[PDB]
């Protein structure tokens, strides 16, 4: 959401951390912004697949 983003992705100027299906909840994220981009956010209920797509956490396996 912004011209080049794929499904479930949202363009942002201050990028955070992304998570795969299965990562543990007790992995850190530094509080510094990363480069602008089409982010898949965990804060929105999202997770990355292994082939790079973005899905809702419930659809995980």
């Amino acid at each position: 959401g912004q011209e080049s983003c794929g499904p479930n992705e949202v363009w942002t100027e201050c990028t955070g951390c992304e998570m795969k299906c299965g990562p543990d909840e007790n992995t850190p994220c530094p509080l510094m912004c990363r480069r602008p981009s089409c982010e898949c956010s965990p804060g929105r209920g999202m997770r990355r697949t292994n082939d790079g797509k973005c899905i809702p956490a419930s659809q995980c396996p």
Partner: protein
């Protein structure tokens, strides 16, 4: 700054903005604290990059010049020797910067007070976190300085299974974790101000949050513990 309020002008006189040059301007990237007229304290992860940095003292509103600020360049940078970029969870997230000029002290610019070596706070002590970071998970950066109340969570509870487990170490301080208030992107770099005997001192440098988000229940904000590195701090400066 998730869940706090706007600080009153020039209220936390030892807080600083850390920026890098980019195109026609200067961008805010991390925070930190002033400990001498020509030395600043911050996080290692904020300056692992190779960029062109500056420091603003006496700041409030980032988009307008109100007359209280002073701009100064960064001349040299010392990172703790055990720091490892690949493992923030290992600890040692601390750095020192020597300025190109000595700043002028005044009512808007003052030095921060450090804790005696070795000190450890009790469960639930009172502290505050100051910053220019996002004001909500997935939000936007703040314009004026923000603050929030954020009390201590001891090592025994913080490092247990329902909390952070082994991620947490004895060189760190936890605070907050109620699901309402916390740290957030752009707040990296400290400070964490805590009350002791009715006096304030800087007990932490902000470091990380959990990947699920900024304000999460049972996952308090994590800071480097200053009282653990008092010797290194004094020795570096004296030798230079």
């Amino acid at each position: 700054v998730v869940g706090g309020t706007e600080a009153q002008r020039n209220s936390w006189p030892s807080q600083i903005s850390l920026q890098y040059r980019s195109g026609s301007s200067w961008a805010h990237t991390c925070g930190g604290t002033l400990i001498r007229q020509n030395w600043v304290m911050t996080a290692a992860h904020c300056v692992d990059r190779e960029l062109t940095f500056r420091v603003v003292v006496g700041e409030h509103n980032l988009n307008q010049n109100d007359g209280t600020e002073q701009y100064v360049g960064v001349q040299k940078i010392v990172v703790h020797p055990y720091w490892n970029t690949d493992d923030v969870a290992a600890g040692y997230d601390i750095a020192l910067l020597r300025l190109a000029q000595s700043v002028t002290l005044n009512s808007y610019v003052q030095l921060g007070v450090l804790p005696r070596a070795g000190t450890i706070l009790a469960n639930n002590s009172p502290c505050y976190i100051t910053g220019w970071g996002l004001t909500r998970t997935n939000g936007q950066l703040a314009q004026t300085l923000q603050q929030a109340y954020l009390p201590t969570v001891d090592y025994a509870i913080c490092s247990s299974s329902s909390y952070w487990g082994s991620t947490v170490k004895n060189s760190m301080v936890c605070a907050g974790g109620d699901g309402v208030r916390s740290g957030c992107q752009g707040d990296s770099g400290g400070p964490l101000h805590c009350l002791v005997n009715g006096q304030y001192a800087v007990h932490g440098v902000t470091s990380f949050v959990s990947r699920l988000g900024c304000n999460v229940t049972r996952k308090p904000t994590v800071f480097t513990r200053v009282s653990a590195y008092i010797s290194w701090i004094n020795n570096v400066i004296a030798s230079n």
